[PDB]
């Protein structure tokens, strides 16, 4: 990768914790009679011809899914695991259903008169405060 993928152009996914991942779907592999073989891939990717020894430990599927991780970690799934470890992290990735509020059926550490919702006192939203009937 020459280019550090800065521009979130192409659709990269989550890892375990929250570390990203570069996902590359195996289409077809193209196994060579002299031992190499590229994969075909039909996203940020094209055919990638790998050494005979390296295709003989890289020997994936063809129609899973393989990753690359930040941490040099490139390794082929079946979709369930793959997507789950290595697209998701929670069903919710970059969690844009709590939007800027972080406070719709979430709240993402609210500490009540959040200065960038209710500055100083008067809070907004929900009538006037959420607690107002003890």
Same mark, same amino acid.
Request: glycine letters at 8%; hydrophobic letters at 35%.
């Given at each position: 990768?020459?280019?550090?993928?800065?521009?979130?152009?192409?659709?990269?996914?989550?890892?375990?914790?929250?570390?990203?991942?570069?996902?590359?779907?195996?289409?077809?592999?193209?196994?060579?009679?002299?031992?190499? =073989? #590229? %994969? !075909?891939?039909?996203?940020?990717?094209?055919?990638?011809?790998?050494?005979?020894? /390296?295709? $003989? +430990?890289?020997?994936?599927?063809?129609?899973?899914?393989?990753?690359?991780?930040?941490?040099?970690?490139?390794?082929?799934?079946?979709?369930?695991?793959?997507?789950?470890?290595?697209?998701?992290?929670?069903?919710?990735? =970059? #969690? %844009? !259903?709590?939007?800027?509020?972080?406070?719709?059926?979430?709240?993402?550490?609210? /500490?009540? $008169? +959040?200065?960038?919702?209710?500055?100083?006192?008067?809070?907004?939203?929900?009538?006037?405060?959420?607690?107002?009937?003890?």
């Amino acid at each position: 990768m020459a280019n550090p993928n800065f521009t979130p152009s192409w659709p990269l996914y989550k890892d375990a914790d929250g570390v990203y991942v570069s996902a590359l779907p195996i289409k077809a592999i193209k196994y060579a009679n002299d031992g190499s =073989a #590229n %994969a !075909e891939f039909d996203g940020p990717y094209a055919d990638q011809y790998m050494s005979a020894q /390296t295709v $003989a +430990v890289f020997k994936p599927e063809v129609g899973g899914y393989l990753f690359r991780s930040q941490y040099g970690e490139l390794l082929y799934m079946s979709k369930t695991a793959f997507e789950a470890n290595y697209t998701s992290a929670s069903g919710s990735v =970059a #969690n %844009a !259903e709590t939007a800027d509020k972080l406070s719709t059926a979430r709240t993402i550490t609210l /500490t009540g $008169a +959040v200065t960038g919702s209710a500055s100083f006192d008067g809070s907004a939203n929900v009538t006037i405060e959420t607690t107002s009937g003890s």
